[model samples]
Target: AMKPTLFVLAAGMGSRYGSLKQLDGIGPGGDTIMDYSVYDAIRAGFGRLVFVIRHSFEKEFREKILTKYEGRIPVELVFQELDRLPEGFSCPEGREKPWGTNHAVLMGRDAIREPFAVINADDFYGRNGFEVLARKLMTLEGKQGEYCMVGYRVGNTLSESGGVSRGVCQVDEKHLLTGVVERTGIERTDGTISFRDETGKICTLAEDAPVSMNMWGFTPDYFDYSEELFINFLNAHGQEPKSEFFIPFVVNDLIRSGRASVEVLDTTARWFGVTYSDDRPGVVAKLRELTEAGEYPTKLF
Candidate 1:
């Protein structure tokens, strides 16, 4: 049996943070969030690591990021640029932004042949999240249109800054996702957490509501689906420089068309992020706490 691969969506440079948070060493052992993620994924039986990144930061990533994990787990990288579009689709004029997260994921099509788990580089998805995702991915080896995601609690994912974005999910009795709406500007005020619904109206949510922090599991069939739909996306919105083909966009389409079903695997892990400078101290402290508690080693390889 082939172990699942870990596909990290790292091309996204958090513009809001004004620094390369992807490489930020938040843990006391000087481990970045990605470092912790790799450690967790390797232990969870993920056999390979495929990172999608840009050429601009290739040197830094190779020197700073890949160097640490070389012998620990198998590693490789694929580049994601605006020009890496399908046949007959060149990047639209003035479209400087990368086609977004799903496109970054597409870069992995060549490097990854087994079932895989996809995650953001800067999110501190705890060890339990990896354990659950990897376990689910193992079952998806020969399955198509069958997927899984590690669902974090809404309260556990909220940021201390202005707002955070999440794929707010609707789940069924079978623990399968019915739909997931991409919601941005979700914030907490006083003691209440709220989000702006699609109707442009304010909606409140429970602290324990499940949310998607971009952690997902899929068989290799997902790459073809993403490639096929990415062309549709380019046809529809490629003209707009800021338009993005997000991962949820692809998953939502498949769910609506009855092409696929996503199992929402609940995780015991709390989530933290490095997108905002303000949350740095809290994330660092959390890492320190985990280390002090012996949940992680003083230095994670």
Candidate 2:
């Protein structure tokens, strides 16, 4: 069986961060966020790296991002385009932004045939989280419909700079994910955490509630499932300019229908990412602190 692969989603430009946050150097030695992720993944036993990106930034991503890992790990690149859709489906006019995380993930369908873990390129999911996921991914070989995610505490995932989106998961007593509600506009307020609902209703959330940072473990069969769902998603919301086929939406459906079960893997690691421009300094500082603490070396290639 193929060893677990790390699928890094770097196609996004992080419009909110005002620049290409994926390539921003946060580590002590000018290492981008993805650099640390690759470092941790290798130490945790991941054998391959697949990055989903856009052709528009291919030149820069190759020269600045992928070059560091040469000969260190098996790395491959997949492109996510506005028109790379299923048969009978085409990109809608004026649709500039890519579909969403799930669409970005679908790009790896051909490149990844092994059990894999998916993570955001710009997010800093600590070492412990990668360790936990890498271990679980190994056990998923020859399995189908059995998936897992590294769950982070709600309070630990909030942003001080602005609101953010999260997959607030509901777990059974055994820690199997029962459902995941995509909560947007989630932010901390006056020492309490809350999210603004679709109806503009303000709702409070438990600080320790488990949420998804998009750190997911899945088997190869997941690609087929996502492909089927993408068609359904396009039929429903393809005409809507801003509608996105999020990962949680697909996982929730599978769980509720008994087609799949998601194990909520717990970790001590904290989650951090750049959702706004103001989040950059804090991210830089956090990486530096981790380096000094010996969690990461100053230089990672």
Candidate 3:
């Protein structure tokens, strides 16, 4: 079977981090977060890399990120533009934001034909996650509706800077995902984990709960399902200006409709990310620590 492809979602504006956190160098030797992801993916046997980036930063990413990966692997760049929506749908006026992660993912439909893995550009999902994902994706060749995700412990994914959103998951006895609820405004308070609901009530969550950090494995058929669902999403929330069509929404629909079953692959990977400027130092320190411990080399490219 062909080795799986790696899809990096790098199109976000980084509204919470306040800058282009995508190119931020958190590694020991000026390597950006995406560099580490690509490095890990290579080691894990991914054959190709496809990046979903915004046209606004095309020049920047090409100059900074693309140059480094040149001649090392098969790399393709796909731009995520608001106007690249499905036919019969026009981008609403004043909607400067791109649709969402799933929309960025749709940009890769033509570039990716094999089973693939998707990850965030800014987050540090450890090496083990990619290994697990690569192995799972290999087994998923020629399969449909058999998706997988690397489930990390909620405590390991929490940001020290402030509240962050995560897909709180419920996995069955077979480690299959039964449900996933997107919990917004999640933060640790007074040494306890909790999230503020729409009613403004604080609800506590277990530290070890498996949560989705957007590390997913899927077959090429996912694009078709995602496109069908995106049209439905546009129909319902098209005029809402800020509404997003999230990947979780599409996955949830697929699960409820019996079109898909997701396996939650457990990982020992620790997650660290820069959701805000304050979170950068912690990430840098952690990268340094990991390098010192030999988890990663001093220089990652």
lDDT of 1 by residue, 190-241 (tens): 9999988878999988998889999999888999999999999989998997
Clashes in model 1: which pairs? none
Ranking by lDDT: 2, 3, 1
For model 2, give the RMSD to the true fold: 2.4
lDDT of 2 by residue, 1-301 (tens): 4679999988885343333344567789898787888999999999999999887777776776778997999889898888989999989998876798899999999989889999998788989999999999999998999999999999988778888888999999999999998888898889889988789888888999999999999987999999999999999999888989888989999999999999999998888888888988888899889999998878997
- The predicted structure with the larger TM-score, 1 or 3, is 1
Clashes of 1: 0
Per-residue lDDT of candidate 3, residues 88-127 (tens digit): 9998888876688899999999999999999998788989
Backbone clash numbers for all candidates listed: 0, 0, 0
Superposition TM-score, candidate 1 onto the true structure: 0.95
Candidate 3, position 123, lDDT:
81
| Shift of residue 204 alpha carbon in model 1, Å | 1.1
Q: Which portions of model 1 show Cα errors greater than 4 Å?
A: 13-22
